[PDB]
Structure 1
Amino acid sequence: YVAALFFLIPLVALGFAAANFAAVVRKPEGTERMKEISSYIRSGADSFLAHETKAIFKVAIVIAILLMIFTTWQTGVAFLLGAVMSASAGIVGMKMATRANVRVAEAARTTKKIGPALKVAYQGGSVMGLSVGGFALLGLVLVYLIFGKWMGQVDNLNIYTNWLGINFVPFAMTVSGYALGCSIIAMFDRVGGGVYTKAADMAADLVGKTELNLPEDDPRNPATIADNVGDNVGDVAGLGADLLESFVGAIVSSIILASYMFPIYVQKIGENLVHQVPKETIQALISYPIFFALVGLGCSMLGILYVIVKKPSDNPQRELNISLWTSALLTVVLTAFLTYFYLKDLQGLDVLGFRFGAISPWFSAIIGIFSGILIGFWAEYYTSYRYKPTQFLGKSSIEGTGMVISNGLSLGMKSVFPPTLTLVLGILFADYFAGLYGVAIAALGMLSFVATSVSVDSYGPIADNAGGISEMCELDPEVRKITDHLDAVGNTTAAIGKGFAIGSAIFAALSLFASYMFSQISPSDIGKPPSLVLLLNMLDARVIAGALLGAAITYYFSGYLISAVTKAAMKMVDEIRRQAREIPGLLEGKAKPDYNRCIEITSDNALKQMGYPAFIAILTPLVTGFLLGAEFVGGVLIGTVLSGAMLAILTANSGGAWDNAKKYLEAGNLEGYGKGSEPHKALVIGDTVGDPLKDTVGPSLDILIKIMSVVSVIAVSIFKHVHLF
């Protein structure tokens, strides 16, 4: 059937990724010295990611076994699968970037043009994007085919009850396991890599620029290699796992909602249950987001393929925007026909929230897509120095450091309102068209072109690394200016991707609130009306107290991450000072600095600290649940969603703005004052403040929300009646 043809699409995506890999590795590579340093970075990155992968997969096996014990084994299986998929996305991403980075450098060096570097960098990110979409939908469609069709978990869709008292739906619990795996792995990865790269970058930039008057990425600085290796580890793999888990999060959210919808919407007539919605419609609504995601992936492929070729323009940001726009538009247009034809005659839609026929989920999809796009636009507005706010931030450096920090935090706080409002109208309209299912599908719509988003976002770290390499070998300033252009653009794309992630996370979070309320239902209370189930009252003390708690947990989470960064950051600062002092000829370029120490500090600290956050995210709903019940947990999830929603956008836009303001002054756009000036130092301090926020605190929330909510959805059946207080 056509099903197999759609099953080909992720495989074609993987093939495209491998093709781009081959195309980029084909590049001639700059210099033997460049190859050497790049090989060093490869060694460090591969090492750290190896230790990471080891520990995280150990923990993943443990958790998976625990799931197979306390739930269905299919849960643990899908868990391991998704784990492998996300981890593989990370590994492929890094292994690609580490080799891809040199090509950009040589391109900009020889051609002295932005075009080539832009192209190779874009292909570099493309590999990772296609890897993300491909892996996600591959694992997903594997779960779907194997567990849903062969085992017939989509067949029954009735409320079950295994031992220990957990009320579950087989397929729902399975995909729950999948998404949970993805979330845990993503969290571990990006926390570790995050702390690593941010400690390294903070120390390097701070001491190097402000305490030694060294240029950015100077080989005299023993911390620069740590910065680049960190860029390869954190800003890359973490992003892949992140947006993969966000994509999966949205789709699996839709699937769970749809699946739980069927056995619940019964009408109790004289002790007889009457299914108000037929099984066929439900199954169709279960398969719908998968085929959706496949089509979206395809369109993303069309867009990316169109871009990597094409007549290269002198403006990269415009090109990437064209990529996203074309991918999104194609996605919309094809989704129209997909939605119309697939859901043509089901008749049972009117009962479960469909207002305007069967074209409703396409409308909700459009809502999600347009929402994501607007988020991108706003993010770019607040972070790029081509506009007012970042220009003001950079220009404000004349007044001091305190002004940089203050106006930075202010910018962060102000930049919250537009995408949040966009999300509000998004939720309201999606709910208007197709209700909760509409919201769940809108979450997917925002990330329907996840491949292009991940690509455009991953385009940045390659540029940053290319700059780091360009500075180390003392090249023509054309290389540095081009690479700085690409790097600033990348910094914008990061903020954009973050916005997408947190938005989709929020829609999916609402849908997961719905599913969470559904999951509480036992086979005995199957007759209860849907309206009485979907009820999470704020005036209940446990619920609002829950919200407050969850909020505080999010904030303390952020604080813990920041502290974790500042530890190795400080230690490395002291290390840089000590090396600059005790090594003669180091600052004169007549003595090679000890990079391995700087590597060791952040590596050790990251490996040590990385454990706690994920464990907290997993155990919180458990302990709060067993202590105070399900309502309290619902509250916790709410507060978490809100506070995470705010802090993510804040940190993202603020950090991006700070960095791009630094790069703004570094481009000499501010008259008189330059790289060695005091305002430059102020913007540098600002950037070092924004670093642990934008690349460690921000996304960790968008993961934490989904993992915590899914854990809650799964475990709720236990402490719903087995709560202590």
Structure 2
Amino acid sequence: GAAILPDLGTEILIPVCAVIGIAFALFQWLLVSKVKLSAVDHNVVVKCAEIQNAISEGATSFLFTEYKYVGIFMVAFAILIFLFLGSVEGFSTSPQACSYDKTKTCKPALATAIFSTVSFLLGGVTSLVSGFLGMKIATYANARTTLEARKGVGKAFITAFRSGAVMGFLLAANGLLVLYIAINLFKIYYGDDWGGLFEAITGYGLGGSSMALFGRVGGGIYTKAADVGADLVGKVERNIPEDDPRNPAVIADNVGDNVGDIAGMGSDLFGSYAESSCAALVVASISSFGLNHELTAMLYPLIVSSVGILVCLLTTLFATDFFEIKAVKEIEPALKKQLVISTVLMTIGVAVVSFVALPTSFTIFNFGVQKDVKSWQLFLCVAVGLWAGLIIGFVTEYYTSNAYSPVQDVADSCRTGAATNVIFGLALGYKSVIIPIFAIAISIFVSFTFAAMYGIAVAALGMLSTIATGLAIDAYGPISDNAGGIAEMAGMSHRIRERTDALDAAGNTTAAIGKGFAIGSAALVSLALFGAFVSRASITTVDVLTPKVFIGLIVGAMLPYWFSAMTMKSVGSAALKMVEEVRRQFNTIPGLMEGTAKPDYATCVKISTDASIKEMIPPGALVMLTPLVVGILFGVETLSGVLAGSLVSGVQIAISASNTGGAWDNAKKYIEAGASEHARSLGPKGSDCHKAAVIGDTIGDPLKDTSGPSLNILIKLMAVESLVFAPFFATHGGLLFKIF
């Protein structure tokens, strides 16, 4: 009937867990504030701090500019939501029959047009705040982990990891607390209409990912224009070290890590968290939980996320307190232990939550029919996504860490030049999709079979249930990356850079793992939302063999390529400009190459700024307008096909791009470290094998930091966007077919 945990217990447990997470983030920041520096050894400390500030200012300054354009576009788009959703019942103010049950009376559509607009703006704001907080902690932790590197890898690891945990706990706890509050606020207006309530709440996911789209693309173009320009002139052309202060692009580069890899990705992951919770809420709201107004069972997804914060806090302790890194080969294994521990504990967590927060039987909406489901089946839906995630992590590690043969062979292929390096790296990323796809399909089959779109949605959330940790291991990498850049720029000892290099290479693997979790969960939520879209738009069958569905399927499968085209070329063009800028400085400013004059950092910052702010617009436009263009002109059947093809096609290029790029970076890192004889035989730095590895690395740079990771957003965003506009498309869409 109803569950062991009462509605009130749930109303308390969720925000408590949120505050536990925020508290624990604040505590970790406090620990990290113990490492001291300012700009007012000791000369070294002053240099770190001066470098931290330059970076800190650059990141702040670009986010402010980027957030200004995105906030304006957000406001415009919120108006389209209001207008389009408001037009379904001609802006009437009267109630009408429930979309989900014509025998009942529901709040007016116009109202849901307003609360959708509201949840949208909430999600956009929470997304910018996610990116921004992430950027604040990263640009605060970077120099601190550099200084801690003076004491050994282990101490630097620890401060990079605590700081990632600050980012992970703040975003997980925050995205959860804001949703919970918005649900409770909305419920005041909605009453017994839970359908209209969680329909309205859907705009939150749409707000998260809409903003994430620009954050990832804008940041991604800023950082990679710099990265490529810096590394090419400096390492390939001039034979100076990576991240050398004579290099005019290096500040842009390191600012880059913070505005892309940190702020773009914090947004992106908030988008994933939000869409997944929303997808689950929407199907539950017209299932037994929502129809019977059972609030615990209804908020099962938030209860899972709540218990996930607890599990991740416990998990974090293993890497920060219970264990110490003494040898570099211990870094990658430690990060991985974080995944294994959280997954195991979280399986326990989800079982307890399922025992306590669900009745043993209930029904789940299934394309018009109430399907009988058991709490043990729903446990299995969350679990399969949770384990699918771990699988994806293990395979990604295998294909991107330089501790294994796929990356070692890519490095090796450098002996025959850049061409063979690239060909091997491309083959590696292609090859890498196989198992993650099987994992995704298995977890689709199981969750779909057990609980239809609800099953699939909470399998997406299961995959993201350990997101505080996931964000911790990922945020850890750009912090480490900056740390080594500050070392080189501070003039510090050769062996400080060796330590940070080793943290950094582990970070490379870890970034590829986050992209995997983001692609796996995007595939799952997007499928759940596609199905919810189909119901909400009153389509009886999405029949692949009809002209409308098929042209949607093939065109939708083209979109990820069109998107990749724009974003690769933006980076290509901007990087070309950056190389010319860097060259100009080295060739023209007397004493630059000799270390006696200062480079002009601001000109490189500007090339990145201009290119990104300008070139983020078409890809953003492509993704946000496609559902509106196709929904209005062609209709819901054709958009159905678009969503299916973009999902299935988009994930392939997304996985292969990220793993290719990750593999070229770590192959280059392998040569740079010379930690085995095979690795030493490709060296030293500046060797022909090394330069071939650098060429691969910088082709990989836009693949994995601009186009690849954003593709997961192209897919999940079109999908929520379609669902939110479903009533409008069902009613007023399909124009070309109405006319002729």
TM, length-normalised to structure 2 = 0.90
Report the counterpart of residue 333 of structure 2 in structure 1: 318
Question: CA 1:356 to 1:346, structure 2 compared with 1: closer, same or farther past 3 Å?
Answer: closer
- Report the counterpart of residue 161 of structure 1 in structure 2: none
Aligned to 2:93: none
- Aligned partner of 1:92: which letter? L
The CA distance in 1 between the partners of 2:224 and 2:615, in whole Å, is 13
Partners of 2:365 and 2:723 lie apart in 1 by 26
**Corresponding residue for residue 467 of structure 2:** 450
Q: CA deviation at 1:307?
A: 2.8
Paired residue secondary structure (1:310): coil
Shift of 1:515: 0.2
Give, in angstroms, the shift of residue 319 of structure 1. Answer: 2.0
User: Is 2:695 aligned against 1:672?
Assistant: no
Match of 2:266? 240
Whether 1:716 aligns to 2:726 is: yes
Q: CA deviation at 1:285?
A: 4.6
Q: 1:688 to 1:278 in 2, by over 3 A?
A: closer
Which of residues 148, 152, 157 is equivalent to 2:190? 152
Does the CA-based 8 Å contact 2:70-2:214 persist in structure 1? Answer: yes
2:712 to 672, 682, 702: 702
Q: Which amino acid aligns with 1:326?
A: I
Match of 2:599 in 1: 593
CA contact (8 A) 1:372 1:503 kept: yes
1:686 aligns with 2:703: no
| 2:383 counterpart of 1:366 | yes
Q: Is the 8 Å Cα contact of residues 285 and 291 (structure 2) preserved in structure 1? A: no
Are positions 1:178 and 2:186 aligned together?
Answer: no
* Counterpart in the other structure of 2:564: 558
The answer as to 2:149 corresponding to 1:132 is no
- 1:204 maps to which of 195, 205, 230: 230
Per-residue CA deviation, residues 272-296 of structure 1 (Å, 9 max, x unaligned), is xxxxx98227755531111111111
1:84 is aligned to 2:98: no
Deviations for 1:389-448, whole angstroms, at most 9, x for unmatched residues?
A: 000000110011110111111101000111001111111122233333211111000110
Which of 483, 500, 509 is the aligned partner of 1:492?
509
SS of corresponding position for 2:202: helix
Given candidates 368, 378, 387, the residue that maps to 2:404 is 387
Q: Which residue matches 2:104?
A: none
| Cα distance in 2 for residues equivalent to 1:282 and 1:615 | 40
Q: Tell me which residue corresponds to 2:284.
A: 258
Contact 1:629 1:721 in 2 (8 A): no
| CA drift at 1:354 | 6.3
Q: d(CA) in 2 for partners of 1:55 and 1:592?
A: 32
Asked whether the equivalents of residues 129 and 453 of structure 1 are also in contact (C-alpha less than 8 Å), the reply is: yes
Mapped contact 2:477–2:508 kept (Cα < 8 A): yes
Which 10-residue stretch deviates more, 74-83 or 392-401? Answer: 74-83
Query: How many equivalent residue pairs?
Result: 685
- Which deviations, in whole Å up to 9, do the C-alpha atoms of 1:555-598 show, x marking residues without a partner? 01111011111121111110111111101111111111111000
Once residues 87 and 618 of structure 1 are traced to their aligned partners in structure 2, the CA distance between those partners, rounded to angstroms, is 18
8 A Cα contact 2:552 2:645, kept in partner: yes
Deviates more, 1:708-717 or 1:482-491: 708-717
The one-letter code matched in structure 2 to 1:431 is F
CA contact (8 A) 2:276 2:457 kept: yes
1:22 CA drift (Å): 2.2
Give the Å deviation of 1:353: 7.6
Query: Paired residue for 1:421?
Result: 438
Q: What residue number does 1:434 align with?
A: 451
Paired AA for residue 338 in structure 2:
S
Q: Is 2:287–2:370's contact at 8 Å kept on the other side of the alignment?
A: no
Matches within 5 A, 1:161-310: 169-261=195-287, 279-280=291-292, 285-310=297-322
1:612 corresponds to 2:618: yes
**Any conservation in 1 of the 2:308–2:466 contact (CA below 8 Å)?**
yes
1:57 and 2:87 are equivalent in the alignment: no
Q: Percent identity?
A: 42
Q: CA deviation at 1:199?
A: 0.5
- Equivalence for 2:89: none
Match of 1:46? Answer: 60
Structure-1 residue corresponding to 2:534: 517
In the alignment, is the contact (CA less than 8 A) between 1:260 and 1:515 conserved in 2? no
Aligned residue for 1:247, secondary structure, equals helix
Flag the 1:212–1:542 CA change in 2: closer, same or farther, 3 A: same
Farther off after superposition, 308-317 or 465-474:
308-317
Find the residue that maps to 1:386 and give its secondary structure: coil
- Are 2:350 and 2:383, in contact at CA under 8 Å, matched by a contact in 1? no
Change (3 A) 1:48 1:348: closer
Residues 361 and 374 in structure 2, CA contact (< 8 A), matched pair in contact too: no
Q: How many angstroms apart in 2 are the aligned matches of 1:310 and 1:54?
A: 43
Deviates more, 1:297-306 or 1:388-397: 297-306
Q: Residues 602 and 349 of structure 1: is their aligned pair in 2 closer, same or farther, counting only changes over 3 Å?
A: closer
1:143 is aligned to 2:182: yes
Q: CA deviation at 1:346?
A: 4.5
CA deviation profile, 1:681-703 (whole Å, cap 9, x unmatched): 11101001000010011121111
- Amino acid across the alignment from 2:622: I
Deviation at 1:680, TM superposition (A): 0.7
- What secondary structure sits across from 1:359 in the alignment? helix
Distance 1:353 1:471, change over 3 A: farther
Unpaired segments of 5 or more residues in structure 1? 158-168, 263-276, 522-532
Distance 1:632 1:38, change over 3 A: same
Conserved? CA contact 1:460–1:489, under 8 Å: yes
Query: Which residue is equivalent to 1:529?
Result: none
Out of 101, 106, 111, the residue aligned to residue 147 of structure 2 is 106
Separation (CA, whole Å) in 1 of partners of 2:141 and 2:212: 23
> What amino acid does structure 2 have at the position aligned with 1:133?
A
RMSD (Å) for aligned C-alpha atoms:
1.8
Question: Residue 612 of structure 1: CA displacement?
Answer: 2.4
Render the CA deviation track for 1:221-259: whole Å, top value 9, x for unaligned: 111111001111111011111111111111111111222
Report the alpha carbon displacement of residue 306 of structure 1 after superposing the two structures with TM: 4.0
Provide Cα deviations, 1:66-118, integer angstroms capped at 9, x if missing partner.
32343321111111111121111111111111111111111112x1x111000
- 2:257 and 2:197 map into 1 onto residues whose CA distance is 38
Distance 1:442 1:428 in 2: 11
For residues 326-382 of structure 1, what are the alpha-carbon distances to aligned partners after superposition, in whole Å with 9 as ceiling and x for unaligned?
222222112212212222355546986867732111111110010000000000000
Kept in 2: contact 1:259–1:282 (CA 8 A) = no
Report the AA paired with residue 300 of structure 2: Y
